[PDB]
Amino acid sequence: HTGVTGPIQFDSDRNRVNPAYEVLNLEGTAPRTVGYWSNHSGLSVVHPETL
Amino acid sequence: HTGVTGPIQFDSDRNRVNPAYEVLNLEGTAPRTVGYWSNHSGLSVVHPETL
Numbered sequence: 001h002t003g004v005t006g007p008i009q010f011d012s013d014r015n016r017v018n019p020a021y022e023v024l025n026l027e028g029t030a031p032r033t034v035g036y037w038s039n040h041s042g043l044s045v046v047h048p049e050t051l
Numbered sequence: 052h053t054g055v056t057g058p059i060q061f062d063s064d065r066n067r068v069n070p071a072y073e074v075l076n077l078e079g080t081a082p083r084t085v086g087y088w089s090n091h092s093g094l095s096v097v098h099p100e101t102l
């Protein structure tokens with residue numbers, strides 16, 4: 001399936017297929033991102049879908 | 052008077068009394084501030100009312 005949270009697929013270890021986290025720094029009056037962690041690359045500044 | 056845009060007062064040169072500008076950097080998906088210019092100090096990182 002392809003849901004509202006992107007593609008969903010379960011491999012042989014029952015995780016989701018491609019997890020990724022958006023590193024937020026809280027310094028202003030709003031949560032700004034400062035990059036993105038992915039399973040594939042890890043600590044990118046681009047969106048993790050381009051990799 | 053004290054309006055919605057703070058205090059308002061006109062000196063002998065017909066300006067407003069204390070002008071100040073919020074330097075915006077446009078790098079994310081939103082305009083973040085990176086400091087504040089004031090007449091009083093000029094290029095502070097604190098709000099210009101504290102000075």
Ligand SMILES: *[C@@H]1O[C@H](CO)[C@@H](O[C@@H]2O[C@H](CO)[C@@H](O)[C@H](O)[C@H]2NC(C)=O)[C@H](O)[C@H]1NC(C)=O
Binds near residue numbers: 015016039
């Ligand atoms: C998370 O990333 C890891 C590392 O790239 C991947 O898991 C490995 O994938 C390779 C190729 O598919 C396999 O040969 C390894 O045996 C895998 N290792 C482990 C520990 O699973 C995979 O791309 C991602 N895994 C998940 C569950 O998202």
Ligand SMILES: *[C@@H]1O[C@H](CO)[C@@H](O[C@@H]2O[C@H](CO)[C@@H](O)[C@H](O)[C@H]2NC(C)=O)[C@H](O)[C@H]1NC(C)=O
Binds near residue numbers: 062066067068070090
């Ligand atoms: C903007 O800041 C300037 C500089 O601090 C000030 O203007 C001077 O103020 C002093 C003291 O009040 C006077 O002696 C000078 O004659 C002023 N100079 C000029 C060119 O006006 C003042 O604090 C602020 N002026 C305005 C219009 O906001």
